[PDB]
Structures are given as C-alpha cells and as structure tokens.
Amino acid sequence: HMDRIIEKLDHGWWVVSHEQKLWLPKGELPYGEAANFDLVGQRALQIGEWQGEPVWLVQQQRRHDMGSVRQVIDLDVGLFQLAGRGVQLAEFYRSHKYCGYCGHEMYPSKTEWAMLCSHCRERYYPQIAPCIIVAIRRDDSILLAQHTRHRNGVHTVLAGFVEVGETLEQAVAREVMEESGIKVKNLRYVTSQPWPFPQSLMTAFMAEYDSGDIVIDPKELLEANWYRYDDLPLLPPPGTVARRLIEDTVAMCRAEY
Amino acid sequence: HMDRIIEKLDHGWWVVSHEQKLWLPKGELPYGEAANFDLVGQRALQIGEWQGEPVWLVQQQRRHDMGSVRQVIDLDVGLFQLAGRGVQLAEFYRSHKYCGYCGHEMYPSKTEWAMLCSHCRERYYPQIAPCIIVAIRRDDSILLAQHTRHRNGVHTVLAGFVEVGETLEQAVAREVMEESGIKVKNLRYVTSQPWPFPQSLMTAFMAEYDSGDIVIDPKELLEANWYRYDDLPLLPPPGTVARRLIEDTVAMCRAEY
Ligand SMILES: [Zn+2]
Ligand SMILES: [Zn+2]
C-alpha cells in the first residue's frame, strides 16, 4: 500500500482531510471521478474499499465545507468507520513526523500502518484507546445526558476513556460517578465496536441505578436526567452503539409491562 | 508528582529499571531502606504505594539480576501491576524524548502521566492496547498452547491484540483462527484486567469449539492441543486471568459430570 498521484479517470470515495476535518461539499462525502472534485494531480492513499470501490485519503485544505468526521455517522455508519480512519491516519502521520526516540524524520511504512525512522530501528503504530459506554436503567427510566463537547441537542448515554490500572467495570463505575454522581449495579457487558477518530474501542455496558442524586460535571455535560422509556427526547442516530443500547433498555422495559 | 534524589532513610519498594528490564536481586523485588540497595543519591519517582509504602521508580543499570517484569507475576500479581507500570513509564519516556510533531526535546508533565514539549503545545499520553484472551472448551477438553515467546513450559490459553476496525468478538475469532486454525462459537465475555507492560487491557472470553483441526503458527506457538479438564499440564500462576479462565472451564466441565 503506497501513495500515488491521482489521474483523470480515478474514481471512488474521497476523504480529503486537513487539520482533523474532512471535506463534505453539500454535506456529502465526495464520490465519483477525481476530475469532478478537482483532485487530479493530488497525491492520494487508498485506505479501504466501500461497496467494491476504493476509498482514497488526500491531504488538502478546501476553502468551504470542512467539518468533523462525526457528520458522516448521519450519512452512513459503515462509511463513517473508513472516513474517520483516514482522518486518524493523517493525524498519526502528523504526530510522528519526527522520531520520538532519536529526533530524526520518519516516513510511513509501505507494508503496515506504521511510521518508520530514517535513522534508527524504532517504529510506531496507531493506538486504539479502550473506552466504555453505558446505558443506566432506573426502573421505567433511562439516564440520558447532553454533552458540552457536541452541543447538538442530542440526548445520549455516558461514555469515557479507560484509565491506567483499571478494569472495564472499574472504568464504568468511575466514569458514571464522575460525570453524574450516581452509583450503579448489575453491570453487564453487551457488545463492542470500533470508533475511528480518535481511534478507540467502545465496550458497551448495561447497568441499573443503585444510589445517588444527579450532579453533573459542567466541564462534561450540560444537562442530565432520567427519561421515561416510552417518552424519549432526541436520540443518537439509528445504528450507533449509543442508540442500540438505549433501544435495548427500552425493549427490556417493554418486557416488564 | 515530581522526581527527587533518594536520601539515606528512604524506604519502600524499588523498581530499578534499564532497557525494559528490572532489578530482582535474589529473584525478589527490592524492598527496604535505599541504603541497603545502594540507591542513595539516585533520582527516583514515586509511581504508587503498596501496603501503605511507596513504590519508587529508578532508572539505573545493575550488573546482575536484571530481568523481565513477568517474573513478578509469580511473586505477587498485585505488585506486578505497579512494577510493570514503572517499566512501561520508563519506556514511554524513552519513546518520547523528542516531540513527534516538531522535533524538539520533551519533558515529563508534573500533573499527569504525560510528556510535554519544550517548544510546541502538543503532548503525549501512554497508550493502553486492547487485547483479547480466550479459553476454548471442547466438551471435556480445553485448548492450551505453549508459546514461542516465553518457552517457559507453561501451557496456557490464546491471546492477541485487537486490530484496527475490529470488535472484541472479531478479534477473538481472528486470533484463534490465525494461531490454531479452529473456528469457535458461544463467545462470551467474562471479565477484564489491565496488563502493565506492554500496557494493555485484557478482555477475557469463554468459547466453545465449533470446527477445524489444530495447525499452529510456529512464529506464535510451539505446541497446542486439547487437554482433558481433570488432567491438565503445567498452568499459568494462580490469580492470573489466564489461570482463572482455565479454572472456570474446569468448573463448568465438573458441573456436567
Ligand atoms: Zn529514530
Ligand atoms: Zn513539539
């Protein structure tokens, strides 16, 4: 897997990335012939395929329509994984322009997704951050929060990075306690999914309210409350782990009615 | 949390590390007054406490008794976590002597376990690699392998790094297939534990044999076979995730007898 100059008849999906953003003209991920996106002559890297068509990464700034890769979730959750990894790879290259061991310039491996040193023998691989995500059920109610980071009107479940020395279970209890001040029980693992940028592994849990009153960390959350399961506010998009977890909670509440 | 010169009456546990090894005179982790280990005047960093006593990291080479931090598992599994993190932290510093973004020298944060840049605003955090570990049951039998890496006579279960774009479940199936050529079913998550060096999060699964004949990747394993549950060879130490998983398998087989 090596980079190359785009030609006129090159076709596929174009992940055109600059400064942790990607280009989404008309709010869509560029699809089609390179010439229609003024991409001929640019250097691109194939980072995957989607529906038997290449996905290309290109590092270029555009004047308009640069945005976060989260916007792609709402387009297609599968393509989101490809596009975000593109964005992550550009950031991985940027954070390893110089060798942390010896200070010389690095260059990308051709046989792995790695950064190699022009001088020494060391190398770097992109990291995957373990993450928890948890839906907390209180009887016929579920805890949903609006996050400060997004400010997008979407009510969702709690999530955080696993810290050094912690199990997933300890990460769940800690994160919940920190963000909302509640204690949980009946922790149960339900599934996992990759998240592409920042590159992470989300482990999804279900849990029941144990004790405490909600007091939000304002650095993390704007609002948090218990919402009756059959009367929920605006939720994350269908197909996301967050949404699937909320809907399973709804399904279990339905089961006790 | 800042480093400092060891004085005569300093006391505690001494993680004395050089080149990914630590000092284990008489095969034990140094415990006691600094003066008894010729450590006075060395620069140390407190990385934790164990049984209300500080754990100190010191970067120094010793002539004898330098070894892998795995040796500490057999001493104490809890102290293992502290010591290995010490070793990991020394490696984290070494891999970030220079800034990957701009090439200038870095220096350790005093308020977080992070590396800060003398020139720019970027920073690095130690990574935690998500890992799977799986015990495969075939009826009254369990799959145990001897690994090429260790060559220590210990028969254990299968484990591997989660790769980009994979769920934990996909990582289990892939790793098993790759190392042993068997297909599994009834994947179930049982628990998680941190591993300190290389710093990782181990998610432990239980699984049942589905299909295939054992063909080992010699790069990974020396030997692999099915072992009757009540007649097992040499196992990993009590208290490890690997051991606990093997013993739960034994417990379930016992339950069907
Ligand atoms: Zn180098
Ligand atoms: Zn820098």
Swiss-Prot record, chains A, B:
Divalent metal cations. Mg(2+) or Mn(2+). Binds 1 zinc ion per subunit. Signal peptide: none annotated. A divalent metal cation 1 binds at residues 159, 179, 220. Zn(2+) binds at residues 99, 102, 117, 120. Its EC number is 3.6.1.-, 3.6.1.22. A divalent metal cation 3 binds at residues 175, 179, 220. Changing residue 195 to A: Abolished deNADding activity. Substrate binds at residues 26, 70, 112, 125, 193-200, 242. Optimum pH is 8.5. Keywords: Hydrolase, Magnesium, Manganese, Metal-binding, NAD, Zinc. Changing residue 175 to Q: Abolished deNADding activity. GO terms for biological process: mRNA catabolic process; mRNA stabilization; NAD catabolic process; NAD-cap decapping; NADH metabolic process; NADP catabolic process. It catalyses: a 5'-end NAD(+)-phospho-ribonucleoside in mRNA + H2O = a 5'-end phospho-adenosine-phospho-ribonucleoside in mRNA + beta-nicotinamide D-ribonucleotide + 2 H(+); NAD(+) + H2O = beta-nicotinamide D-ribonucleotide + AMP + 2 H(+); NADH + H2O = reduced beta-nicotinamide D-ribonucleotide + AMP + 2 H(+). GO terms for molecular function: magnesium ion binding; manganese ion binding; NAD+ diphosphatase activity; NADH pyrophosphatase activity; protein homodimerization activity; RNA NAD-cap (NMN-forming) hydrolase activity; zinc ion binding. Pfam families: NUDIX, Zn_ribbon_NUD. Changing residue 179 to Q: Abolished deNADding activity. Its cofactor is Mg(2+); Mn(2+); Zn(2+). A motif (Nudix box) lies at residues 160-181. A divalent metal cation 2 binds at residue 175. Residues 126-249 form the Nudix hydrolase domain. Belongs to the Nudix hydrolase family. NudC subfamily. NCBIfam families: PRK00241.1. mRNA decapping enzyme that specifically removes the nicotinamide adenine dinucleotide (NAD) cap from a subset of mRNAs by hydrolyzing the diphosphate linkage to produce nicotinamide mononucleotide (NMN) and 5' monophosphate mRNA. The NAD-cap is present at the 5'-end of some mRNAs and stabilizes RNA against 5'-processing. Has preference for mRNAs with a 5'-end purine. Catalyzes the hydrolysis of a broad range of dinucleotide pyrophosphates, but uniquely prefers the reduced form of NADH. Homodimer. This is NAD-capped RNA hydrolase NudC. It comes from Escherichia coli (strain K12). The lineage of its organism: Bacteria, Pseudomonadati, Pseudomonadota, Gammaproteobacteria, Enterobacterales.
